[PDB]
């Protein structure tokens, strides 16, 4: 899921 | 990416 990956990336940035 | 999600899930299991 692109949505899920981007959410994790944004949480950790 | 389904693969990327599954990679993260597997790393944390």
Residue numbers in the entry:
A (entry chain B), B (entry chain A): 1 to 13
Please quote the paper that reports this structure.
The hLL-3717–29 fragment was suggested to serve as the active core of the AMP, showing a different spectrum of antibacterial activity as compared to the full-length protein and other fragments, including being the shortest LL-37 fragment retaining anti-viral activity.
The gorilla LL-37 (gLL-37) sequence contains two amino acid substitutions when compared to hLL-37, with one at position 17, the first residue of LL-3717-29, substituting phenylalanine with serine (corresponding to a F17S mutation). gLL-3717-29 exhibited slightly weaker antibacterial activity against M. luteus compared to hLL-3717-29, with a MIC of 53 µM, similar to the effect of the F17A mutant. The 1.1 Å resolution crystal structure of gLL-3717-29 displayed a similar assembly compared to hLL-3717-29, with almost identical backbone positions and root-mean-square deviation (RMSD) of 0.15 Å, differing only in the two N-terminal positions that lined the central pore. The overall structure of the two is highly similar (RMSD of 0.15 Å for the asymmetric unit, comprising two helices and a similar space group and unit cell dimensions). The pore of gLL-3717-29 is more occluded, due to the orientation of the lysine residues extending into the pore.
